[PDB]
Amino acid sequence: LMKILTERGYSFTTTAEREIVRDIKEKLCYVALDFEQEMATAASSSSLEKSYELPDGQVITIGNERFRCPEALFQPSFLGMESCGIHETTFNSIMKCDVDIRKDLYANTVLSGGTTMYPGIADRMQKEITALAPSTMKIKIIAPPERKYSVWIGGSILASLSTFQQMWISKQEYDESGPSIVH
Amino acid sequence: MTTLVLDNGAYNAKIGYSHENVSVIPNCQFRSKTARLKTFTANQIDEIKDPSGLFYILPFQKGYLVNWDVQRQVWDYLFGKEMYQVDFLDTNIIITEPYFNFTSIQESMNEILFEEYQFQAVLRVNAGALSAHRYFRDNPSELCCIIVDSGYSFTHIVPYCRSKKKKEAIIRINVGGKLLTNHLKEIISYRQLHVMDE
Numbered sequence: 269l270m271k272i273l274t275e276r277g278y279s280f281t282t283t284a285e286r287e288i289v290r291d292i293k294e295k296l297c298y299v300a301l302d303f304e305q306e307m308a309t310a311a312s313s314s315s316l317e318k319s320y321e322l323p324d325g326q327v328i329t330i331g332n333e334r335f336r337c338p339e340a341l342f343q344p345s346f347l348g349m350e351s352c353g354i355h356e357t358t359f360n361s362i363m364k365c366d367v368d369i370r371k372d373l374y375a376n377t378v379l380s381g382g383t384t385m386y387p388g389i390a391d392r393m394q395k396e397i398t399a400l401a402p403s404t405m406k407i408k409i410i411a412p413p414e415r416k417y418s419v420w421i422g423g424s425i426l427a428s429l430s431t432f433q434q435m436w437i438s439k440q441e442y443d444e445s446g447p448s449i450v451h
Numbered sequence: 452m453t454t455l456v457l458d459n460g461a462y463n464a465k466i467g468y469s470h471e472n473v474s475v476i477p478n479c480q481f482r483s484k485t486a487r488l489k490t491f492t493a494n495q496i497d498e499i500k501d502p503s504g505l506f507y508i509l510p511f512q513k514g515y516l517v518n519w520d521v522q523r524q525v526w527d528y529l530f531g532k533e534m535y536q537v538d539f540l541d542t543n544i545i546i547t548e549p550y551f552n553f554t555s556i557q558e559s560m561n562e563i564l565f566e567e568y569q570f571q572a573v574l575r576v577n578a579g580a581l582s583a584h585r586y587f588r589d590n591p592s593e594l595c596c597i598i599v600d601s602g603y604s605f606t607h608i609v610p611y612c613r614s615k616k617k618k619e620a621i622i623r624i625n626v627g628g629k630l631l632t633n634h635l636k637e638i639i640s641y642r643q644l645h646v647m648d649e
């Protein structure tokens with residue numbers, strides 16, 4: 269993204285500067301047409317350039333990185349490092365998984381993490397997984413409204429689970445097995 | 452030839468041959484709450500790097516014997532190495548016996564000594580009788596002596612005269628070193644907290 273902004277004209281070169289580029293993700297995180305979104309939007313750039321707030325007041329109509337590298341997740345070849353597009357990567361995962369369990373894998377595909385806050389990830393995963401998967405199996409995507417910290421929330425719940433007491437490792441067994449415990 | 456003198460009780464099991472092995476070797480087994488419940492023997496306590504909370508398995512909790520298993524295990528672990536040089540029929544053993552001990556238990560102990568360890572000879576001398584003989588040898592001009600043996604688990608007032616003990620003026624008292632230690636434990640527990648059992 270810093271290289272993209274350099275092509276634009278800002279030309280940042282260090283983290284102390286591109287902290288604001290990191291922040292740009294707060295608004296420039298949408299993608300609709302994974303194959304031609306950036307071109308179709310550069311052709312009709314209006315009401316899509318959120319104009320991120322630069323410190324110097326430069327509100328230039330950011331309208332290409334709005335759709336460039338939210339899609340880099342689905343198209344690794346777009347960056348330069350090659351890999352299965354995030355969607356087909358998850359698909360290959362559930363494919364290598366068992367056959368019977370693959371139905372529940374299709375039906376319970378969760379999305380979590382700070383990077384998943386991109387509003388378009390849900391719909392794009394829906395479309396790509398429906399294109400890559402059979403017709404009988406549907407895609408019941410579930411993106412929690414607060415997926416930003418879903419991992420932390422679930423961990424805190426698992427920790428403060430009522431009858432989970434017996435499963436905590438303690439000094440008692442540490443003093444006789446140490447790290448040789450289940451690990 | 453050499454001989455093996457053995458005195459035994461609740462706290463201490465003092466075995467020694469004609470020249471060395473002079474120490475306070477205990478008689479009970481120790482189990483460490485931390486060392487995977489390993490059962491230690493009389494002298495193996497020195498191998499325990501943390502004797503806190505040791506559970507005591509006692510062949511004697513007071514003057515009389517209980518649970519032969521522990522006593523026989525202690526004797527085997529002692530004999531198995533430098534302490535006695537397990538050789539059996541080469542030498543003999545002299546074991547002490549309480550003032551008024553279980554007749555059946557003591558004769559069965561003699562039976563076991565003759566059968567399993569097969570010492571070429573052993574006798575029924577008394578713990579107080581041995582001290583009486585020691586004192587008589589120390590003072591040959593004496594003809595009568597009273598022994599006040601206040602052991603760690605014993606308190607015996609035993610007379611001796613004309614090389615014979617009389618079973619009428621022979622007193623034993625249950626106030627022993629073990630009782631004193633337990634009372635100190637209880638006092639410290641009660642006066643620092645409401646429970647403490649080390």
Ligand SMILES: Nc1ncnc2c1ncn2[C@@H]1O[C@H](COP(=O)(O)OP(=O)(O)OP(=O)(O)O)[C@@H](O)[C@H]1O
Nearest residue numbers: 290291293294295297380381382383384385386416
């Ligand atoms: N609302 C958001 N929209 C888009 N991107 C975001 C958002 N919030 C955070 N990010 C990006 O996601 C990253 C943080 O990831 P997240 O906190 O979800 O997991 P993480 O703990 O940071 O990563 P890891 O679990 O590997 O430590 C940040 O580097 C940030 O650029």
